[model samples]
Target: QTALTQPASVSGSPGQSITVSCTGVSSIVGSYNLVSWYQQHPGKAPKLLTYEVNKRPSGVSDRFSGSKSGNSASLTISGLQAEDEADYYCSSYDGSSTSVVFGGGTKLTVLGQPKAAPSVTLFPPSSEELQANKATLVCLISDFYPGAVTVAWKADSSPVKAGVETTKPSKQSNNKYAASSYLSLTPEQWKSHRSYSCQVTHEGSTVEKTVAPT
Candidate 1:
């Protein structure tokens, strides 16, 4: 049931640091190291957080680190953010029952929660679509968290209430999220290069992108 022994929970402030332990630290016992770590959030899938004992994936806050002694290994997270709270597990090269049974999950708790912002883009209809008398514009939002984002459309600064389709935020393989909004308009309106825009309200901010037919 596990790679090694781990704690039940750890807590820290939003700006503080926390260390999660994997006691006994191995399925192989004295092999060397069963040193991989993963993070699992609510309703989200688990993902590798550290590899080979301590290799931080790029952009891992530069605050998370892995370390090992002759017989033990550990994971440390600093600059604690709210999203940091969740279940964590470790892995080893060794296989079998003992690993699964002992590979306990650690739950982290943050005093202050954090928010993840999305990277958004609005794509104008292609030239061919613009020539077809009807076209569709796309608004793509990615890497957002909490999945409560919204999308809306405007033409010449006026709210658009027709010919619009929006997709709810979807979970990604990396445990992030993505969403899209589509706007349908006529060639006469689109090719005329009317000022069109996509607006996304996420977290506490509203982001808008404007476009013109090319």
Candidate 2:
């Protein structure tokens, strides 16, 4: 089954904000909007925030937002406060086995101050090798706080590039998003050892993983 793991805690101050990230595989959480966000106080059930990737549940604050690009999904909360200090978790549906997975949970600490930028991680493709014909490459970023992300593809030894065709985002079971891009090169190009890489960009940093035929 496709599952997820998350960090335990993060700290911020009053008027400051922090981000927590959730990690998961593309096959389960990356392909759809079956992802959800939850908030928990020191002792209470989780409260729903953004669901279906970018849709907020009824009566939820506008401070929370969701987004999906490529295979990654994210949630963001702005205008931090002491009352906002709590544990956050991201969850996604795993269609293969019909189950749910969650991030480890992050504890946000508010110091009554503000900060810039948040934590970021690059979600790479599950497969590292591509066949010698028409194929699609995918990069998955799951359960990132403040879902602002970009993805690109590049060929062997050249600067990383975005795919000519547009990548598509699909929904999973619990409100998560997964994205994929197609590369329709001639068989000749595939045999030339044209290694391709999928890169995920977030929070001013970039992370990439590569896939190519042996």
Candidate 3:
């Protein structure tokens, strides 16, 4: 597959279990059984939870479990605790390309209080990564919580369908949480005098930000 796919975000009250799904092509997770899962907090590198499909590394807890079937894989956190509220990602080796790839990411929020709409900002492509032919769009959502939020993108206010890479809602050291998503674009198409927006949703309220390149 081009890259792993996952839900933008998911939430639950404390003590409730939560699950995350990841999908890829047969060439990777399906044929090789090399899928792995990771957990991370804001500003920290990921810690591997599962590797070699469903096997947890030594010292990892059984409360964190993994599974795989065909082109899809999943991770489940049982008897959830506040410390479990963090970002998760699934990954697998792309046997065909001899490389490893990761899912967009999914955020699990443990509801402590009513949530708030995210404060969002749009970060354009690095100005160099896209100078070639394809560019990436990055959006950061933060400073509001119970840490559950979702993000979507549109080009010139029209919906975009492919090449989206989103992160799990991750806890910031300040106690607020942040999530992010990236969209890929062609140098000639939407980037040519276009305005793009990131629309976010949390607790039924929506917040948005836009960027225009002329």
Candidate 4:
């Protein structure tokens, strides 16, 4: 069975409340009340937050609560704190099977986590591949917040989907994110294009860097 679906992220400031939702199927969530929630900080084990849909474990913060409606369950955190920045997950005892199903996890950001725009740089094709008739352009994106960014390639203002590969944003040691996209082309094709650019969209803002044949 597929895992439950959850939003990739949610955020709130201290003293503010936020709810991360877990959407499941009837066999897992609606058919039973055995839903649980967990909180996990970076580089630490997960701690049980809520069980039996809305019951809190001993010593767990009363500010953390859970609720369910139909095939959906929700984990709400009231009076958000800085330490509340972590990942949360939900689980349910599958009525159709003896095993439990879990959610894909949600990232909770606290302290009014600010969004960081990515620094983008576009690199021209390397000369090493010139003899081989293969050219690859690199677009580097660094220091982005929330780990969500969309990358696109444009050739002379037209979308260039072919021969484009983008990697998922990866967190760095500094807690920022970095990603790269490669545009493959033949040496002749690279020179024939008037201009090529990489466009990165993050937090409703778009940044582009252009390169020309050299």
Which candidate number would show the highest TM-score if scored against the true structure? 4
Question: Which 10 consecutive residues of model 2 have the lowest summed lDDT?
Answer: 115-124
State the C-alpha lDDT per candidate: 0.78, 0.61, 0.81, 0.88
Q: Which is the leading candidate under lDDT?
A: 4
Ranking by TM-score: 4, 3, 1, 2
lDDT of 1 by residue, 1-214 (tens): 3246777888888789888777665445446455788899878788888887878788666688888775567888988876687898876665454443335789887754446888889998887876666789999999887679988899888899999999978777655689999988887877665689999999889999999765
Q: How accurate is candidate 4 locally (lDDT)?
A: 0.88
Best-first order by lDDT:
4, 3, 1, 2
lDDT of 4 at 7: 97
State model 3's lDDT.
0.81
Off by over 4 Å in 2: 1-3, 113-214
TM-score for every candidate vs. truth? 0.50, 0.47, 0.52, 0.54
Which pairs clash (backbone N, Cα, C closer than 3 Å) in model 4? none
Question: Candidates 1 and 3: which is better by TM-score?
Answer: 3
RMSD of each: 6.9, 18.7, 14.0, 8.1
Worst ten in a row by lDDT for model 4: 24-33
Clashes of each: 8, 29, 3, 0
